Amino acid sequence: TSVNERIENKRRTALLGGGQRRIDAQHKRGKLTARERISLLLDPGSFVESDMFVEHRCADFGMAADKNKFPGDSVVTGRGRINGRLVYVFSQDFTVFGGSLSGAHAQKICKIMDQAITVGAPVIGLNDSGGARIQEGVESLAGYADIFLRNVTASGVIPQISLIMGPCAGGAVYSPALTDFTFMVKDTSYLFITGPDVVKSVTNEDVTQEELGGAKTHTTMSGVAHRAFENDVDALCNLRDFFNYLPLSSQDPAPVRECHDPSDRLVPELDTIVPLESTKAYNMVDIIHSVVDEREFFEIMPNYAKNIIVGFARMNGRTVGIVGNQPKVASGCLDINSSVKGARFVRFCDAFNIPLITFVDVPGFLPGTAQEYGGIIRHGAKLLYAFAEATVPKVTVITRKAYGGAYDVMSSKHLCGDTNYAWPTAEIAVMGAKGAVEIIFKGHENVEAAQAEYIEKFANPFPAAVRGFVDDIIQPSSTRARICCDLDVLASKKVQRPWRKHANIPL
Amino acid sequence: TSVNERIENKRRTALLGGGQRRIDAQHKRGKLTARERISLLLDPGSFVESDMFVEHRCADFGMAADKNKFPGDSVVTGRGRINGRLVYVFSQDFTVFGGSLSGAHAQKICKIMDQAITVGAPVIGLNDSGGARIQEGVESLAGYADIFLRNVTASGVIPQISLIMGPCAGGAVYSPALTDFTFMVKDTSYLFITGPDVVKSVTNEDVTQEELGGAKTHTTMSGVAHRAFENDVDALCNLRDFFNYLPLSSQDPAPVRECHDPSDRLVPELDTIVPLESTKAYNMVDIIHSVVDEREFFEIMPNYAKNIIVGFARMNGRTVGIVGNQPKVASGCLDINSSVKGARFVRFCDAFNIPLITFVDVPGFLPGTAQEYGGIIRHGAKLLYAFAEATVPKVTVITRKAYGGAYDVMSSKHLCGDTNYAWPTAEIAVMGAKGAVEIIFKGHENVEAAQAEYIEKFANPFPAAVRGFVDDIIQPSSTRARICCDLDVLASKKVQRPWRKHANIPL
Ligand SMILES: *C(=O)CCCC[C@@H]1SC[C@@H]2NC(=O)N[C@@H]21
Ligand SMILES: *C(=O)CCCC[C@@H]1SC[C@@H]2NC(=O)N[C@@H]21
């Protein structure tokens, strides 16, 4: 056998992976293989695979046998482009040793992370594993340590996107916790530290795989996964479109893309969304959809902390992040869960120079022992900090209510905001007229007259505007045009801040 | 066997190394072991050994047998102090696998280099090896690559001192080429890429070990080793004293140490060293010894390029570097070899904030085809650059001759010097009076009168001094006091220079 023949056989084996019968199982299971997934993700013909001939060096427990020598060592790594833009990817291959992490496995992933940091290119990981490769022992633990170090170092330098498309257990579960966004695939992906076998052995509780770490749990109740997609093909199609929003590095401005939607059009549909009756809820999403370019909005965590809306959109071609209250759910009140989702989203957009638009309608905080015992004070400070720290353009629109300390938490002008607009129905106060009059006028005669006088003077947007809290009071139909104008002039804004070794968010 | 018993046996094996019989050979050979050498080098009780329990992971060619498992894997690494000052060291142990370099071998060395860079501590290596460990194959080549990368990265950050105390072959020979100073041990150390067996196989020439790569060759003819010491014990004793001159990092000022030698004393011995007869040589070393604190001078490469003197000394407690000509050898003329030694010494002292004192007495360059064919133009530019680039205090004293372009090469005031003094016998000119008059007065009558007129006006230190080339003309007896005064006021001097990615020395 010649050298060239050996090489050709090594290429064909790396392409097959764990063997055709294991591929057949993956397809029976409704899953794509690691190499098929890359072909869908990246532009045709743009993918360049690295280190395809790397094999493990472990010789213990029979691992020195030729029957265990799978070139590629369970990961596909390399670089490519999505719509002409450079991206680094890796995808874990479940057909070789179960997708378990070896020393060399982690290495290959680390090397492309080092290039991505060096050139300033994003990294997308497609995760699917069973955990560490116990046959090597502590080399897989060193593998995890090296990946974790890169994931932390890359934070704020390049965006890191993780899509989980299968099981995930052991140390693998912490890389999505270090990246910026985590997505899952409904009823196909799992994310858990230990399996149901350990849970039942430790505590006398019964649980199945879908209940312990299923995609529905992590997108609806734990707040870990940002969005689950129906299947592998739809998940990668939406991932490509999501990719188009983000810059390649934090040194880059928010991407600007060709846009046909006139920036100066009016939106008459906004003038009557907000009811005059204070106890009538409305859907904030109708406002978000009508303002954003071509009515396209990418919603993050649609099923978790529904009282606050966060997501991506484009206005006049430029990527922006949108945060707003949802009065339809829990009167639009802040709670622990909403503060966690908000702070994380805001922090990402600030780090990568993506402007923020805030739609405020918040009557206060959710009362009760469930929130007080949960540390609502500690968690609420997370959203206040996330806005106060921001140095990217911030445009706030107040649609109806902003009572109490929630006024400042939801990116008020006094946290170094750029512009703040009020709609005619906006009301800014420490509390509603009923509470304020009962406290201010206590024991006096003709309280009912005092109630009428207070409402006429303070139950509107004027006592705040005349003080400099609001820059203008605008007709809702003009909101989009007003925001577009601010975005196109604040984009070159820089501010100074004292030197710090690093930030100290309340956590 | 309990866990504690196993640990105690692992400690005793690491201390023994390659076994008592191999130690016996080392002592028969007149050599100390790697651990005995550290005890001599570092302050008693200050040494802390790291990673004493590390073993190789190679399982091929029988390397998995328990009989090959030597804890420490042929290197002693760790940290300590010399006179209270932190230093990182490693010493290669020849008794385990011949001192050959394994993957893990290089690792352990790299880890202490990473700490030394992080804290700002010097590194001293004691080298003794036979080359790569061929049983591992390409892992030892990766080992060399990682060491080389650290040695380059540390340059200009911490000083790196290498003492070779045994054979050195293969890739190992390049680490002393990356460090700042290389020392050897006479008739015990060797430094060669390939052995005499390869040389005789390639070319029809006979050579022995001492001729191919002996300490005498590298200190006298190739200019690679800075100084050879008689034996292992004397080599480490002089190394400790050398260590006391250098700062721990380039962020530190030149060390200042208690000194009893008055800074303002006169040195009458200098007034009559330089003869009035222009063709009478004198020994520059008598001037150097009489100026420096307590007449202590550390001479570098005493037997190579004897026409130029470089070394370390202290004036008023502060470490300084001294460069000067030696008129005793080749009239004090510059050549290829002298330019190489000078530029390297000057560059080190500048990088680590050690002031320079220059004693100039140079009639020009060595003529002939031996120098022209050797690239005297290219090599002479090395010393000119090394001085011109310097940003540390530079004090120049001109004792007798400075003709031609050599005037500027030997750190003239026009290369951003701080002070420049002339002795009464100094003469600065493009060329001597005889050549200048024959060229200026060609074909004229009464040339002999023109010769007398030229000598009376130009053959002294005045045509340069009246132009601003010399700051003062001083009596030699006051030289030391004048230099001490300049050093104590230039020490806080900083200059600005345009931004550069990196320097581009002519090479
Ligand atoms: C009736 O008195 C209940 C009042 C709750 C109104 C809302 S709920 C959360 C905010 N906190 C608060 O005190 N008022 C707001
Ligand atoms: C006799 O004419 C030889 C003159 C050499 C004098 C010295 S040697 C090196 C310098 N170069 C030079 O032209 N003169 C100096």
Q: Method of determination?
A: cryo-EM
Query: How many structural domains comprise chain A?
Result: 2
Q: Ligand 1: which of A333, A334, A361 to mutate, judged by most atoms within 8 Å of the beta carbon?
A: A333
- Please give the sequence-ordered ranges of beta strands (E in DSSP) within B242-368, or none if there are none: 298-300, 308-315, 318-325, 356-362
Closest listed ligand to the CA of B333:
2
The distance from CA A228 to its chain's CA centroid, rounded to whole angstroms, is: 12
Centre a 10 Å sphere on the Cβ of residue A503 and count the other Cβ atoms it contains.
Answer: 8
> In angstroms, what separates the C-alpha of B52 from chain A's closest C-alpha?
19
Q: Is residue B362 in contact with ligand 2, taking CB distance under 6 Å?
A: no
Residues of A identified as active-site: 170-171, 405-406
The answer to whether residue B213 is catalytic is: no
Residues B246 and B294 placed together within one structural domain of the fold? no
Element (H, E) at A9: helix A3-16
Q: Which of B123, B236, B226, B127 is nearest to B171 (CA)?
A: B127
> In angstroms, what separates the C-alpha of A80 from chain B's closest C-alpha?
28
| Residue in B137, B388, B405, B491 annotated catalytic | B405
Cβ atoms of B324 and B307 within 8 Å: the answer is no
Q: Which of A256, A117, A235, A106 is nearest to A181 (CA)?
A: A235
Q: Is residue A346 in contact with ligand 1, taking CB distance under 6 Å?
A: no
**What gap in Å lies between CA B265 and CA B293, rounded to an integer?**
11
Q: Which of A95, A87, A74 is nearest to A41 (CA)?
A: A87
What is the rounded end-to-end Cα distance, in angstroms, of chain A? 62
- What's the alpha-carbon Rg for chain A, to the nearest Å? 26
Residues B12 and B69 placed together within one structural domain of the fold? yes
Report CA-CA distances (Å) from B147 to A143, A406, B129, B140, B179.
22, 57, 15, 11, 11
Experimental structure resolution, Å: 3.0
> Parallel, antiparallel, or unpaired: how do β-strands A318-325 and B227-229 relate?
unpaired
Burial A142-175 (b: 16+ CB within 10 A, else e): ebbeebbebbeebbeebbbbbbbbbbbbbbbbeb
> Parallel, antiparallel, or unpaired: how do β-strands A85-92 and B123-127 relate?
unpaired
Closest listed ligand to the CA of A367:
1
DSSP designation for A43 = P
Q: Is residue A365 in contact with ligand 1, taking CB distance under 6 Å?
A: yes
HEC-encoded secondary structure of A354-370: CCEEEEEEECCECCCHH
> In angstroms, what separates the C-alpha of B59 from chain A's closest C-alpha?
7
Centre a 10 Å sphere on the Cβ of residue B251 and count the other Cβ atoms it contains.
Answer: 11
**For residue A470, what are its two tokens?**
């609001």
Residues A252 and A301 placed together within one structural domain of the fold? no
Chain B residues with beta carbon closer than 8 angstroms to that of A62: none
In the sheet where A160-164 sits, what is the strand order?
Answer: A48-49, A75-82, A85-92, A123-127, A160-164, A181-185, A227-229
CA A434 to ligand 1 centroid distance, Å: 12
Q: Which residues pair with A42 in a beta bridge?
A: none
Residues A304 and A175 placed together within one structural domain of the fold? no
Burial A51-71 (b: 16+ CB within 10 A, else e): bbebebbbeeeebeeeeeebb
Report CA-CA distances (Å) from B366 to A224, A469, B304, B372, B507.
77, 83, 16, 9, 20
Cβ atoms of B120 and B80 within 8 Å: the answer is no
DSSP designation for B22 = H
Q: Which of B284, B455, B271 is nearest to B360 (CA)?
A: B284
**What gap in Å lies between CA B24 and CA B85, rounded to an integer?**
33
Report CA-CA distances (Å) from A248 to A86, A120, A244, A258.
8, 6, 10, 18
DSSP designation for A494 = -
Cβ atoms of A80 and A42 within 8 Å: the answer is yes
**For residue A377, what are its two tokens?**
């004070």
One-letter amino acid at A279 equals T
> Parallel, antiparallel, or unpaired: how do β-strands A394-403 and A356-362 relate?
parallel
One-letter amino acid at A74 equals S
Could you write out the DSSP letters of every residue in A428-456?
EESS-HHHHHHHHS-S-S-HHHHHHHHHH
* Ligand 1 atom at minimal distance to the Cα of residue A431: 14
CA B342 to ligand 2 centroid distance, Å: 21
Of B234, B257, B280, which marks where a domain is finished? B257
One-letter amino acid at B70 equals F
Residues A210 and A273 placed together within one structural domain of the fold? no
Centre a 10 Å sphere on the Cβ of residue A440 and count the other Cβ atoms it contains.
Answer: 11
Centre a 10 Å sphere on the Cβ of residue A92 and count the other Cβ atoms it contains.
Answer: 27
Centre a 10 Å sphere on the Cβ of residue B101 and count the other Cβ atoms it contains.
Answer: 28
| Residue in B14, B116, B406, B422 annotated catalytic | B406
HEC-encoded secondary structure of A134-164: CCCCCHHHHHHHHHHHHHHHCCCCCCEEEEE
DSSP designation for B158 = S
How long, in residues, is chain A? 507
Residues A496 and A398 placed together within one structural domain of the fold? yes
Closest residue by CA, ligand 1 atom 10: A364
**What gap in Å lies between CA A323 and CA A342, rounded to an integer?**
7
The distance from CA A187 to its chain's CA centroid, rounded to whole angstroms, is: 21
Residues A246 and A346 placed together within one structural domain of the fold? no
> In angstroms, what separates the C-alpha of B135 from chain A's closest C-alpha?
15
**What gap in Å lies between CA B225 and CA B183, rounded to an integer?**
5
Residues A410 and A354 placed together within one structural domain of the fold? yes
| Residue in B170, B317, B364, B380 annotated catalytic | B170
Closest residue by CA, ligand 1 atom 14: A364
Of A257, A289, A324, which marks where a domain is finished? A257
* Alpha-helical regions (H) of B261-311: 285-291
**What gap in Å lies between CA B83 and CA B75, rounded to an integer?**
24
> In angstroms, what separates the C-alpha of A139 from chain B's closest C-alpha?
11
Q: CA angle B385-B386-B389, nearest 5°?
A: 75
Q: Which of A273, A276, A259, A280 is nearest to A332 (CA)?
A: A280
Q: Is residue B365 in contact with ligand 2, taking CB distance under 6 Å?
A: yes
DSSP designation for A246 = S
Q: Which of A114, A118, A57, A49 is nearest to A78 (CA)?
A: A49
Substitution target in A53, A54, A55, A57 with the highest count of B β-carbons within 10 Å is A57
Closest listed ligand to the CA of A278:
1
Measured over the CA atoms of residue B10, residue B14, residue B20 and residue B22, the dihedral's sign is positive
Cβ contacts below 8 Å, chain A against chain B, sum to 6
One-letter amino acid at A226 equals H
**What gap in Å lies between CA A230 and CA A285, rounded to an integer?**
23
Closest listed ligand to the CA of B371:
2
Interface of A with B in 53-92 (CB under 8 A): 57, 59-60, 64
Q: Is B390 helix (H, G, I), strand (E, B) or coil?
A: coil
Residue-range definition of the domain harbouring residue B193: 1-257
Centre a 10 Å sphere on the Cβ of residue A374 and count the other Cβ atoms it contains.
Answer: 14
Residues A276 and A331 placed together within one structural domain of the fold? yes
Of B222, B257, B292, which marks where a domain is finished? B257
Residues B77 and B146 placed together within one structural domain of the fold? yes
**What gap in Å lies between CA B136 and CA B59, rounded to an integer?**
9
Chain B residues with beta carbon closer than 8 angstroms to that of A59: 59-60, 64
Q: Which of A425, A80, A396, A469 is nearest to A278 (CA)?
A: A425
Residues B135 and B14 placed together within one structural domain of the fold? yes
Q: Is B64 within 8 Å of A64 when comparing Cβ atoms?
A: no
**What gap in Å lies between CA B183 and CA B240, rounded to an integer?**
13
CA B408 to ligand 2 centroid distance, Å: 17
Q: Which of B321, B316, B270 is nearest to B293 (CA)?
A: B316
**What gap in Å lies between CA A173 and CA A179, rounded to an integer?**
11
Q: Which residues pair with B91 in a beta bridge?
A: B76, B126
CA A363 to ligand 1 centroid distance, Å: 8
Nearest CA in chain B to A57: B58
Residues B282 and B252 placed together within one structural domain of the fold? no
Chain B residues with beta carbon closer than 8 angstroms to that of A57: 57
Nearest CA in chain A to B136: A57
One-letter amino acid at B337 equals N
**For residue A234, what are its two tokens?**
């739809």
**What gap in Å lies between CA B427 and CA B402, rounded to an integer?**
6
**For residue A431, what are its two tokens?**
């509390």
